[PDB]
Design a protein around this ligand. Structure first.
Ligand SMILES: [O-][O-]
Ligand SMILES: [Cu+2]
Ligand SMILES: [Cu+2]
Ligand SMILES: [Cu+2]
Ligand SMILES: [Cu+2]
Ligand SMILES: [O-]
Length: 502
């Protein structure tokens, strides 16, 4: 397997505006098929990249900055990854979703607002070429990625991911590590052929002859871990505090991260922004689309090589030689200047300072059926994507969503537009629920850990539990979506429209 820690971590460049005034910031990003070297010992890999880059450029904006991005498709008219036509017009459809973005609905990147090359053909929900991001939301790590109907797992795996950072000037006084000491880490697992080409399975292993070919798979686990588009890279760091914006940009894989020298992370932020208080952690779980905004303090580790380690298996136990490793820090870079940064305890308001009335309690089941080929089809509340919309919260109102998970695995449930609070998790009797539809708890409710006391947008719903979250639906009304962010689940068919109504 590929020799670990021989390539330096790329730092994606920050995208520069095409035009900028006090009133408006304008960016252009074109999707291009490109070549990139994923590891020292590999031939260059053919990939799809925002502006021909993998990951795409990092976009940095201020809170309330009035941003527009024209996302353009200049990709080949045929895909290079295996398309299964039985699960769902031009072959290559794309649309860019700003994950966590508080956007009008027609700039949100709806799966059916897709477009082919040069916008020649567009889906039924397409309205605009230029997307508008008013950024009227908390400072946070967002990320952008393809969201095209029935193609998301493929377009994302192909390379269409990037970081998008909202900076709230009100947080600047906290003196968190900044600029060169504030580094996105987009973590993507991949399987890569000897010739350097991406491998994505064309079918489950040992397919029943009943299966079509290609066939969608229910889960994808890559053999190799990349950070910022390089396989098992190293980052030379100065002996001081760094802020890392850790993004799970993987299709299926969940990580459980730790430092092999036993050092701590200081978590300062979750998907929806700064936590009310910093949380010292020795390890953390990170499912697809979750973000952890953390400080690592290397002050006391000069000279050391520290492995960012992973203990979470994907389809099997973690392998010490391969997926147990993410990247390596080498604390050998000379100090550019005095560490003027801080790791404060007091960060932001508690979400609980809000006293919203509960308009509605919405009960939602994670379930599944079997198609004519014998394949599992994962469904939210036993509905298909195309069934009439049922999740219709009223704009400006707060609901509790009670998410019932009787399946065998965790699903990272994601709502577009909003961030939300986590109320609790409670174990229930799965057999009894499956037999009778009755919910019988086998234990008391468990409130969220401090890491989940802030704002979340993608939340792990574990097997045999009811997860409750509270979300205020706004500030916009319109047509959005909610879904499992395991892309293989999302595409078949664990995704539903969400109408925020007026
Ligand atoms: O996908 O959010
Ligand atoms: Cu997303
Ligand atoms: Cu989203
Ligand atoms: Cu799922
Ligand atoms: Cu989504
Ligand atoms: O989102």
């Amino acid at each position: 397997t590929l020799e670990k820690f021989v390539d330096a971590l790329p730092i994606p460049d920050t995208l520069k505006p095409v035009q900028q005034s006090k009133e408006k910031t304008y960016y252009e990003v074109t999707m291009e098929e490109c070549t990139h070297q994923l590891h020292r010992d590999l031939p260059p890999t053919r990939l799809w990249g925002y502006n021909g880059l993998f990951p795409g450029p990092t976009i940095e904006v201020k809170r309330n900055e009035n941003v527009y991005v024209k996302w353009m498709n200049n990709l080949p008219s045929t895909h290079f990854l295996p398309i299964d036509h039985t699960i769902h017009e031009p072959e290559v459809k794309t649309v860019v979703h700003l994950h966590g973005g508080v956007t009008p609905d027609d700039s949100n990147g709806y799966p059916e607002a897709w477009f082919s090359k040069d916008f020649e053909q567009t889906g039924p929900y397409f309205k605009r070429e230029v997307y508008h991001y008013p950024n009227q939301q908390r400072g946070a790590i967002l990320w952008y990625h393809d969201h095209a109907m029935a193609l998301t797992r493929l377009n994302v795996y192909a390379g269409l991911v990037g970081a998008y950072i909202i900076h709230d000037p009100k947080e600047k006084r906290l003196k968190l590590p900044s600029d060169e000491y504030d580094v996105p880490l987009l973590i993507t697992d991949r399987t890569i052929n000897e010739d350097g080409s991406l491998f994505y399975p064309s079918a489950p292993e040992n397919p029943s002859p009943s299966l079509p070919n290609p066939s969608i798979v229910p889960a994808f686990c890559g053999e190799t871990i990349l950070v910022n588009g390089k396989v098992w890279p190293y980052l030379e760091v100065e002996p001081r505090k760094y802020r890392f914006r850790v993004i799970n940009a993987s299709n299926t894989r969940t990580y459980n991260l730790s430092l092999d020298n036993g050092g701590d992370f200081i978590q300062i932020g979750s998907d929806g922004g700064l936590l009310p208080r910093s949380v010292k952690l020795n390890s953390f779980s990170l499912a697809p689309a979750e973000r952890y905004d953390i400080i690592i303090d290397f002050t006391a580790y000069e000279g050391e090589s520290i492995i960012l380690a992973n203990s979470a298996g994907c389809g099997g136990d973690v392998n010490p030689e391969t997926d147990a490793n993410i990247m390596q820090f080498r604390v050998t870079k000379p100090l550019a200047q005095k560490d003027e940064s801080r790791k404060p305890k007091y960060l932001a308001s508690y979400p609980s300072v809000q006293h919203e009335r509960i308009q509605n309690i919405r009960t939602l089941k994670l379930a599944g059926t079997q198609d004519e080929y014998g394949r599992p089809v994962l469904l939210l509340n036993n509905k298909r994507w195309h069934d009439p919309v049922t999740e219709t919260p009223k704009v400006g109102t707060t609901e509790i969503w009670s998410i019932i998970n009787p399946t065998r695995g965790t699903h990272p449930i994601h709502l577009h537009l909003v961030s939300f609070r986590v109320l609790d998790r409670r174990p229930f009797d799965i057999a009894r629920y499956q037999e009778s539809g009755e919910l019988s708890y086998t234990g008391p409710a468990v409130p969220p850990p401090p890491s989940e006391k802030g704002w979340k947008d993608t939340i792990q719903a574990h097997a045999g539990e009811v997860l409750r979250i509270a979300a205020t639906f706004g500030p916009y009304s319109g047509r959005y979506v909610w879904h499992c962010h395991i892309l293989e689940h999302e595409d078949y068919d664990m995704m539903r429209p969400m109408d925020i109504t007026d």
